């Protein structure tokens, strides 16, 4: 249905004479398409998908100048926040930034975001109306006032509802063979006895994309969620995802249990049981 673009930035101070570590990553939906890293030899924005390499030198020069401008801004913020919190010179500290936009299935703008964090905690975030900021603590009040006086929201809103949407439409069309696919889970079930009276049933989903899936167990047609074990969704490494859900069943009750799988690649929710 809807689609989204995200850029994720991380900057970490290294005490003494060392430069901060900086890393930037770009995604369309679940698919990564670009990177930058301060500790790489190339010092360029690099492609991470087959459909983006048709972009010319004018794209790769512009993107390289703009990740270096974010990189240079975070070096100054690391030194500033150390002071706002009255912290000592001895430890490393981390800044994280996420921004991007959501575009609907008809190509219209749905919403945009920006979020900042310092040492893993919320610092400041843009409100859903793209007009004002929410501060997390007393040091973030200084930044909120500074960014209001500078009208930072007005520049960022004009990117989020404008340029972010145009380039998302371009990527979705230019990669339509790969970004707009839907692969159903190649489901199966396995039986693993654990004792003379009990066995474990494991219900699997493999090879699916996008990563949004539900797995649930029922017994006699009643939900067993509180007694279910699940792994969190994991990448396969080839553009697909894996998940499983499992329950301990007393020996002889395997026919009373049933696993339900729900995903966009399935015309209706799919049921499995042991046989």
């Amino acid at each position, epitope marked *: 249905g809807s689609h989204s673009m995200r850029y994720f930035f991380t900057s970490v101070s290294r005490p*003494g*004479r060392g*430069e901060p570590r900086f890393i930037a990553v770009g995604y369309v939906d679940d698919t990564q398409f670009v990177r930058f890293d301060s500790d790489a030899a190339s010092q360029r924005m690099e492609p991470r998908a087959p459909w983006i390499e048709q972009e010319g030198p004018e794209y790769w020069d512009q993107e390289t*100048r703009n990740v270096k*401008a974010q990189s*240079q801004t975070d*070096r100054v913020d690391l*030194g*500033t926040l*150390r*002071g*706002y*919190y*009255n*912290q*000592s*010179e*001895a430890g490393s500290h981390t800044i994280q930034i996420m921004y991007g936009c959501d575009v609907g299935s008809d190509g219209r703008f749905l919403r945009g975001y920006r979020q900042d964090a310092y040492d893993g905690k919320d610092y400041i975030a843009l409100n859903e109306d793209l007009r004002s900021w929410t501060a997390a603590d007393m040091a973030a009040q*200084i930044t909120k006032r500074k960014w209001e006086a500078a009208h930072e929201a007005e520049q960022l809103r004009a990117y989020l509802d404008g340029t972010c949407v145009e380039w998302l439409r371009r990527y979705l069309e230019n990669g339509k063979e790969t970004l707009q696919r839907t692969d159903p889970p190649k489901t199966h079930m396995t039986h693993h006895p654990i004792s003379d009276h009990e066995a474990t049933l494991r219900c699997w989903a493999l090879g699916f994309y996008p990563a949004e899936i539900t797995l649930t167990w029922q017994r006699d047609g009643e939900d067993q969620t509180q007694d279910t074990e699940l792994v969190e969704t994991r990448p396969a490494g080839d553009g697909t995802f894996q998940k499983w859900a499992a329950v301990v069943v007393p020996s002889g009750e395997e026919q009373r249990y049933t696993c339900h799988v729900q995903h966009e690649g399935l015309p209706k929710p799919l049921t499995l049981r042991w046989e």
Partner: antibody
Amino acid sequence: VQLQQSGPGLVKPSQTLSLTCAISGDSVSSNSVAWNWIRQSPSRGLEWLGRTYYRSKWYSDYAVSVKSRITINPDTSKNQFSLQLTSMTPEDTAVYYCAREGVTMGPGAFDIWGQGTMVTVSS
Amino acid sequence: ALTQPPSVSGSPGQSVTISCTGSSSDVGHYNRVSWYQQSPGTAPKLMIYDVSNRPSGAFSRFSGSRSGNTASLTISGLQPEDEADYYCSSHRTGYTVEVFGTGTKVTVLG
């Protein structure tokens, strides 16, 4: 890296001071440095005047005690920068230093210094 | 302002402490501090570039520290060669203007 200062040792009251600091073994438009002016006088100790630096564009900071009278100008063709301080009154009598700071040490860690120039304000 | 004691003194081999203190206008300010030695007739020279950080191993006698609005330079093993005027340098947080301390004269008994 060497920093070489030059300019007049005497300026008349209410005239303009114009000093050069010329850079050797380093580039004025370098994106990892900034170029500074500091002065020393027995009634005020060390006083900081301002900086200029380049990233993709030129930027500057000036101290508020002289902000209205001061400007620091780079010259990329000669690889130097100059201090212009207008309306020199007797209170501007000091020894003037140029200095470098980089990005590996923070701001205010003046790594390399020039030979100080003694400036006199008298009729 | 960034005030200092006018002068300190010690016999050869003793430790002497120089401190410089911010005006207590706000608590988080003066976080990055650096220290300068000035011998008579020449430019200041950098001893310490952030609190307790030395440019190189040549400055082993010199030890920087901070507590509240106060920062300090300790000179251990004081030599007759260590008689000089010493200045700290720092800036308020949210500002780009550097300030120097008033200066402390370190004097060696002999």
